Write a protein that binds this ligand. Structure first.
Ligand code: VNL
Ligand code: VNL
Lengths: 455, 455
């Protein structure tokens, strides 16, 4: 009977309890093969040789064209639009009127009055809502991320999107291009040759080495992929599968999964009435040890997850007054948490204990998340909640379990905190959750992007 | 340049070294979603509620019709054909002229002059070779297993094939049928109602509870699946994904992966010349600690992997004279090995050791195989090789790592052996293999199907 999020929340009891017991299952990185060689070798390659990341299937694409396209973005993003011209991309971050992050994605300025958003569903839903109800002269084509379990059905996208990354990426790129290719400034766009095609590029990189994101019409996907794999054999390039792929951000430092902060607030009711009952926001899940009966305690603002530097008070935008009221110097800060290896061994050991009444929450490798929004409590030595751990897994490059978190600003790097791993009372009813007991895992605060930190 | 297996072996150096360093990658259970809920809950359901196993995509189907169909099977199988009539299936096991197992699969006797084989590629390749070159009046339609990495391409089969299993399976089955359904003898075939369709059935079961395998034309797959899932909600039935699925045989006791024993022998040269260079036999891989430079040391005969009881000297068949010469009472015997939980914890602990020069071979969960043929050495206390471990993984139902093995017949159940886990010299060049050191894992000999055994 409910057709939108507002009706779902009115009929669903406590919002936190609903989301933490959602039956949606795992957040899937679809279609791309889970592994091409093995996930350890694939992780190793992006730090030691080169990789092809296949990004064609796990993000929503919004193609935004028209006289008011730039205005729509400017009105909804914290980012400065000043001096923005085609062939520059930005990390689009929208906040609510209350100053809280809705989501984020990459916005490509392709040409005059022509943009494309690439990212998770929440910020795309927000753009579509405003395009439709705000009176913008703009046309939008929504190309959803691919189905999670296609089960043999054909899958189409409008565009393929790859990245070539690793210390030997630029060697592969120039071999493909047929000569030297200029390294532009980060997120500037140009073009390159691949197998006789003119392929648009986005300057990118990771682990201190320059790389590229590239895209094109879906029809040429195989032609480009096969050229890249062939040219890259000389440099050890290998394709990365969907099992290893999302663990890259544990090393790179981007938190993909802030809760869209749209469940409360009178100024967000119209948006809740617009969001379908089967939307990401209505049907998804929250997993982890952090418990509050107030869904607002799961929200973050942009300063808390590393987007402070993007905020520019040089244009009108939704939530500007709220962000202006925030003191940046006292906001929580994004960090990497390096999980204690002895504690990790104890988590896994419990799976092989035939006599214990319970084991610790299964920690999948290399990505351990079990909802699309992750919220584990971070505790200090007294047991106070001092932060939220929001993305969790393991790096074969570091031989460490790692998580990305936001913690009280005064906590120094090197401090040993605890992450509460697992859920209370045997676990919520999410279909990703087997029965388990919790563990207070020791974790050392470390920089983002991750760098090995002395305790 | 090589077009067949014989040319591949002539140009490829030592046959063992070729197979143990093959670049084929993992043996994939394709297309079906890796997980629907999570693999632990899915494993639990087949012992505690009910499951839908989706078997549509991982086996080769051979449709065999014609006057000489039964003769073709009879001439090539160790099984008795005496009194075989439509609506009975058999576990077809062919051996070479030298008495060694080629493979095995399920052969359904559907009607007069109409059969279907379902199983891995090796026994299907053997049937096709003899149908084609032996002068049999028979027509064969080969429906390959689905591609390992479809990457969004559509996937078709001629038939869908499911199983409904678990202690509540028969409740679900009778709910679907609309009333009582007779439990026939094992592997006898009949029919049932599903959503107004007449669906053919094969009497099956596991863990002491009766179940069914069912099939039909691919077009009705979704209609049947949705009816089964709907009727089964009352009994807790859940679908099982491809990650959990193949671990079922660790509990059930069937070894899927004997090496097709066709690489040597003058009487098998014609078959090697017929097998394509991209066949399973030519392109696949051998993984694990057992090392011999003679590929014949990887062969098994039917007595060694539990098919002794199928051998019937009441018909002419390939390899009969060799099997008649074998003494059944002194052959190695199939067992389950229950791996020591402390040793398992030490394997996983090494992944989180930031100072060690090496870690132990990654043991994936719930299936740890990293080739399509598995060959780990089993050692006694003196270090003698006393068997071969051939399929490896973990059961959440038992909280134990388990493997299926064949060992010297005189070794009593309860004996503590060791399985050598990992490969020598840092590991072979297979793309599934990360660098690692070996471990002698303690393992207790246990019955097949697995039953908890006092040491
Ligand atoms: C940019 O693509 C990514 C997306 C996600 C996600 O949505 O969880 C994670 C890591 C990624 O690299
Ligand atoms: C009968 O289907 C199965 C096939 C395999 C395989 O081929 O490795 C393993 C377990 C199975 O249940």
């Amino acid at each position: 009977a409910p057709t939108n999020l507002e009706q779902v929340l009115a009929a669903g009891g406590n919002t936190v309890e609903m989301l933490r017991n959602s039956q949606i299952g795992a957040y899937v990185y679809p279609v791309v093969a889970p592994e091409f060689s093995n996930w350890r070798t694939e992780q190793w390659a992006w730090r030691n040789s080169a990789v092809l990341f296949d990004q064609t299937h796990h993000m929503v694409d919004l193609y935004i064209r028209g006289k008011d396209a730039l205005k729509l973005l400017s009105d909804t993003m914290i980012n400065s639009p000043k001096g923005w011209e085609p062939n520059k991309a930005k990390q689009y971050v929208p906040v609510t009127p209350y100053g809280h992050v809705i989501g984020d994605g990459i916005i490509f300025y392709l040409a005059e009055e022509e943009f494309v958003y690439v990212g998770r569903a929440p910020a795309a839903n927000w753009l579509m809502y405003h395009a439709q109800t705000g009176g913008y002269n703009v046309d939008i084509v929504h190309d959803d991320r691919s189905p999670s379990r296609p089960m043999g059905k054909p899958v189409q996208r409008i565009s393929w999107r790859f990245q070539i990354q690793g210390p030997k990426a630029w060697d592969v790129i120039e071999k493909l291009h047929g000569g030297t290719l200029e390294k532009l400034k980060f997120f500037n766009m140009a073009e390159m040759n691949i197998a006789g095609m003119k392929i648009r590029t986005l300057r990118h990189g990771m682990a201190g080495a320059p790389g590229l994101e590239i895209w094109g019409p879906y029809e040429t996907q195989e032609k480009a992929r096969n050229a890249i794999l062939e040219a890259g054999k000389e440099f050890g390039l290998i394709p990365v599968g969907s099992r290893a792929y999302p663990s890259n951000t544990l090393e790179s430092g981007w938190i993909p999964s802030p809760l869209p902060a749209i469940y409360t607030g009178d100024k967000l009711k119209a948006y809740r009435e617009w969001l379908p009952a089967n939307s990401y926001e209505a049907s998804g899940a929250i997993g982890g040890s952090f418990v509050s009966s107030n869904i607002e305690d799961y929200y973050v603002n942009p300063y808390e997850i590393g987007y402070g530097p993007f905020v520019k008070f040089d244009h009108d935008f939704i939530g500007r007054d709220a962000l202006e009221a925030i003191d940046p110097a006292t906001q929580r800060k994004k960090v990497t948490l390096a999980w204690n290896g002895d504690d990790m061994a104890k988590i896994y050991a419990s799976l092989f204990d035939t006599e214990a009444d319970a084991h610790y929450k299964f920690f999948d490798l290399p990505l351990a998340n079990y909802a699309n929004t992750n919220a584990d409590a971070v505790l200090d030595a007294a047991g106070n909640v001092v932060g939220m751990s929001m993305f969790t897994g393991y790096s074969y490059n570091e031989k460490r379990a790692l998580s990305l978190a936001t913690i009280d600003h005064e906590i120094p790097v090197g401090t040993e905190l605890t992450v509460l791993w697992g859920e209370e009372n045997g676990g919520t009813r999410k279909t990703t959750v087997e029965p388990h007991k919790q563990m207070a895992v020791r974790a050392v605060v470390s920089p983002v992007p991750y760098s090995v930190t002395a305790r």
